[PDB]
Ligand binder design. Structure first.
Ligand code: HEC
Ligand code: HEC
Ligand code: HEC
Ligand code: CU
Ligand code: CU
Ligand code: CU
Ligand code: CU
Ligand code: CU
Ligand code: CU
Lengths: 456, 456, 456
């Protein structure tokens, strides 16, 4: 027989349990093959890809990644795809692990306001990517149309304390990283494989701060990890920990005791972790500019007792987590809304600036602006700043080097340029600095920075 | 002893059987080591990389990839490399799996009109890439100078019903994707790893349509899969199927039951597939813009009985295969030749347009131009089109959104821009539309589109 | 218990042995767990990244990669990080394989002139990357802040004849490849993952020529191979040889008998090789333009007896090693220093030109300039050259094709353009040619070439 030769469906039909990221449906917990009815709906919708940055996502079930599907090897799946009448595009679905043309795409073409159905037997056990396969296929995937389906072995996977759902994607906006507003899809960047954002679960901060994943010392954690692409291959890594097991798709090979593992575009793996020490453990794409310049960081936060014989040291994790160490950056979202409304206050700028200053400026000038005498000059009550507060704009954009004096002390060092910061970010950061630590006050506007950036 | 320690060559010398892609030489079918004489000739030649697009390829044996070589572990190989007198460049060969300096490159330097020879023992069993290694090495490989050599284990590989030869490459043209004419090699794009085409077996459509690979339900298929690069790593994937086995080079590890697998630049693998359901199964690089925007798709077509218990559904595979669902796009080749000759007719444009309309326009407007009332407006007998047929050029190039009325019906939707289409493609598509479904007729020229594209 | 549960530290504390690339510390050779004290110092310093090209590296222990650390599974490590007072930036360390927040980064933040300490138990056996994790993390890694730590199994690794240390990195300069002078870090190229150099051990030629690694026929060689990134994934390959074993990090899986293997960004592997035939064996990133256009080549040179039954052929390895076949390119370094001083002589140019002519020109015109009658025209005593020595600049920059006559002989062929060469390189090469083989003499300057390059 073929694989998954376990007998005809038995019992009543089961209406499948779909879940939203980062959660997973429960184990099916049964010893017989069933007829499973799956109902999934496409919705096109604006969501925030970053604070104050909107994007028109195309979604399976209202989220990126799409709703998680869970069935048993040998089940017969009757798949119903609906396309909501508000959609502008037609859509379909290709499930990896399906035995048949297009993995379903050939049979699931669905116009706005319509519904399609096709039936397949789940012959192949494993974790699998699904995605839209409507021309132009790359545009549909780039807009968020991907998720995971798990096909369990007949005895089920081994029990663990937590199961989570994490999926990487590369995204292509017309504007640069953190440029505010509604950002269109950019076909030219996509063809060139030059993404502006690389994310877990559809947004910067989706899994950081108050949205981190949780477990306790001693517990086991399984993560179902997808790479929707469309184009990038992930050097997938956990900072400060190790994977007990890594298994790709439905493969017979299992790797154990590794920290860094390559996930193909369109690939999926199951990883297992055992919590040993408290703190924040970071999932990244270790093609490092993705993790630290484009959004590709997620957090598993572990609580419980210290083990000083295993790890003993201070805990200053803002040095690398930067502006994602805090619970959120909601002050930036709020300042951006107020600016669009024409109601932006000095305090709106101050609080947005405070959020952005973490990492970006604090690593050298300190969280309190004091710096370090002779090494990093102070921003707190800075005579150099007060002497020409406008020159601060050029210093942020283009850097500063050479001999200077600040609060009666000599410095001869190098502050690198930070031209990648957007006009609103520079304005908000400097407004924060002017209104803290007994500095003179006032404000800097995005338009002020735009003028300075444009000077030859 | 070393590996492959099977004794001295015995019997008469064997003159090796070389084959052209996508075919493989027969199994050697012998139990003793032999002296094998290999004769391979370099030829530089123009071929079509895409319909109406010519390129000067550099080849081993007249094809891209080059002729397939098949020997037994423990054989002594006497390798003769000839460089045809029509060649402009010198050439050589590096075979992966050879034990010695440059894998042969050090001993096989050959000027136009000359011949070289060197001898090696095949110590290492496996599938291996060979390629040119003449400075500048990257240029030689980018021009097509790569292929595969199989070194069999002494007992031979297990029997299968079919063996095929498929090799990925990245290519660098001065012009953009599908821009017509003789296209030079582009060194700047190559250094930046920004290819214009990513292909199987040296051309768009090399393995699609009437050139697809074949098998029947129940049969086993082995594919020898190479990645010549020069630069890209393939997220190699089969749509709608699974690999029974994947084995890299001569490695001891074998992965089983996977659908997606990473092939390094310069790497090679042997994959095995068992046919279960009829239809078209697609080999792709799942870095998806390569597969659907740059040519990286090949087809295995399976015939035999349906199995409705495994897969039951409609078969509209043009939604993702697009303009490669048809047997070929020969109308485009012909229209391009006629244009170069100054003899391009309206009907030449109509038939080229018909070929290009599949996927590109048909996914929303339908194959018959009827659209879908209230959702996608008709192109068939379109009053909006007839009212200003020239405005159609701007609509294709730059998109259309907002409220419009077409054949007495309101629409308020979004047609994305399609600026990547070349001037001849837009002209031919629109000429097809004007001369179908009782539209007014006439024609649009490439020069008309060039003028509109250049407007601010 | 956890892993590495071998008992409390015993004996006196051990002060750890650190080594500079390409060497490794000795095996620890002990049967008990110890307290190991590690002292490592950050130094920021200018070094030559290529001949006549300086770069400001940020280093662990004065080298790129940083000092190699070697401990035993179950050891307690007391880690002291110092930042030299000459540093301008703060720094820290993340060791892969550490169980705890940031792999240490959270506890090791260290300002210029300061020292930090933290303690960890080495629970996980394997080879692991360490690196700086100070915001902006990508800039710190791109500047050279990475190395390897080995955690031995309790019984030690199997004995071999040689152990070596090789680490790949991608680098981002404002200037182009081989443009002379002090080159700043380029943030824009880094974000886009578009490196100007891709190197082993921090420089072009670090492991070629007189700096090659050595072994003899019959000996075993272990290489500890890292990929510091920040961004690239290596298609890591040995030309003309095979790896007996490849093992990633501390993984349970071991691959055997492969030639090409994918190393993730931030990944590390241990490879094993047995020398079988004399000659130069080349370690490369087989994303080929990295190996042959950006510096990603290193050499293992094997001495001993020939084995003509395994490999029999000539040895012209300059056809692919090009300008790295020679012991060094010190003439280029010297010509660049003299030019900066205003003391550049004709002979300085001649010797720099001689070094650069290897591969670049010699593959077609020969090492003696004679060419090949009717196929490649001579540069030796060339009447065509003497007739208009200035036209030689355009020929190098923009190529030459069509019918020409040279020393009473007809040619109708194609010399590709070589625009990637810098102004000093073209000037030096042509000065070499003018002063060899009874050509007229004189000189060409970098300023002459700059003027010609700028002509429309
Ligand atoms: C990596 C270190 C570093 C980072 C990050 C950094 N700075 Fe600086 N900054 C310096 C150094 C060093 C100087 C002194 C330059 C000199 O000696 O010529 C400086 C000088 C300045 C000055 C002028 C002198 C003074 O004390 O008033 C201002 C204002 C300033 N920085 C603001 C900022 C702001 C705002 C940020 C973040 C957006 C930032 N800096 C990020 C190192 C840094
Ligand atoms: C993804 C959907 C989609 C694709 C693909 C697409 N179109 Fe359209 N097209 C539309 C929609 C929707 C409109 C109506 C726009 C509006 O409501 O403002 C439209 C409008 C038009 C119109 C003007 C209205 C009419 O019916 O005459 C023309 C002409 C047209 N398309 C031609 C084409 C051609 C030719 C192609 C391919 C080259 C193409 N379209 C591809 C969705 C699409
Ligand atoms: C791949 C082959 C190749 C390489 C590499 C190459 N050349 Fe040439 N070169 C030629 C050919 C062929 C011609 C003749 C062109 C023709 O027939 O129109 C030529 C012509 C010339 C000429 C003019 C004719 C003569 O003999 O005086 C000069 C000068 C020259 N090359 C110099 C160089 C220099 C200097 C280099 C390296 C920097 C170089 N070439 C690299 C193939 C090459
Ligand atoms: Cu879709
Ligand atoms: Cu897919
Ligand atoms: Cu060649
Ligand atoms: Cu190779
Ligand atoms: Cu650092
Ligand atoms: Cu790391």
């Amino acid at each position: 027989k073929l694989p998954g030769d376990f007998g005809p469906p038995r019992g009543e039909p089961i209406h499948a349990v779909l879940t939203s990221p980062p959660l997973v449906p429960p184990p099916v917990n049964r010893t017989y093959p069933a007829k499973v009815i799956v109902e999934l709906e496409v919705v096109e919708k604006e969501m925030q890809i970053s604070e104050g940055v909107s994007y028109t996502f195309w979604t399976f079930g209202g989220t990126v990644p799409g709703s998680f599907i869970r069935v048993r090897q040998g089940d017969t799946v009757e798949f119903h795809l609906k396309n909501h009448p508000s959609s502008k595009m037609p859509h379909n679905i290709d499930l990896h692990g399906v035995t048949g043309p297009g993995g379903g795409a050939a049979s699931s073409f669905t116009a706005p306001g319509h519904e399609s159905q096709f039936t397949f037997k789940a012959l192949n056990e494993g974790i699998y990517v699904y995605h839209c396969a409507t021309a132009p296929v790359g545009m549909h995937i780039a807009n968020g149309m991907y998720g995971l389906i798990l096909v369990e072995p007949p005895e089920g996977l081994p029990k663990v304390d937590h199961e989570y759902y994490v999926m990487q994607g590369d995204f292509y906006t017309a504007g640069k990283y953190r440029e505010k507003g509604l950002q269109p899809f950019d076909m030219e960047k996509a063809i060139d494989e030059r993404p502006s954002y690389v994310l877990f679960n559809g947004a910067e901060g989706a899994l950081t701060g108050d949205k981190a994943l949780h477990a306790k010392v001693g517990e086991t954690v399984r993560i179902f990890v997808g790479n929707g692409g469309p184009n990038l291959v992930s050097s997938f890594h956990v900072i400060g920990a190790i994977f007990d097991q890594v298994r790709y798709e439905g493969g017979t090979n299992v790797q154990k005791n590794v920290q860094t593992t390559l996930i193909p575009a369109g690939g999926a793996a199951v990883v297992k972790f055992t919590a040993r020490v408290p703190g924040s453990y970071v999932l990244v794409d270790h093609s490092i500019f993705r993790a630290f310049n484009k959004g590709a960081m997620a957090i598993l936060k572990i609580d419980g007792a210290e083990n000083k014989l295993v790890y003993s040291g201070k805990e200053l994790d803002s040095v690398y987590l930067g502006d994602r160490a805090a619970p959120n950056m909601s002050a930036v979202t709020k300042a951006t809304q107020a600016s669009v409304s024409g109601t932006l206050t000095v305090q709106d700028q101050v609080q947005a600036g405070r959020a952005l200053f973490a990492g970006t400026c604090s690593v050298c000038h300190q969280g309190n602006g004091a710096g370090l005498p002779g090494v990093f000059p102070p921003l707190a009550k800075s005579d150099f700043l007060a002497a020409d507060p406008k020159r601060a704009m050029n210093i942020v954009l283009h850097g500063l080097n050479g001999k200077i004096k600040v609060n009666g002390q000599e410095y001869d060092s190098v502050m690198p340029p930070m031209t990648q910061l957007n006009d609103d970010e520079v304005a908000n950061i400097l407004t924060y600095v002017l209104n803290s630590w007994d500095n003179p006050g006032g404000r800097v506007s995005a338009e002020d920075v735009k003028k300075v950036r444009a000077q030859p």
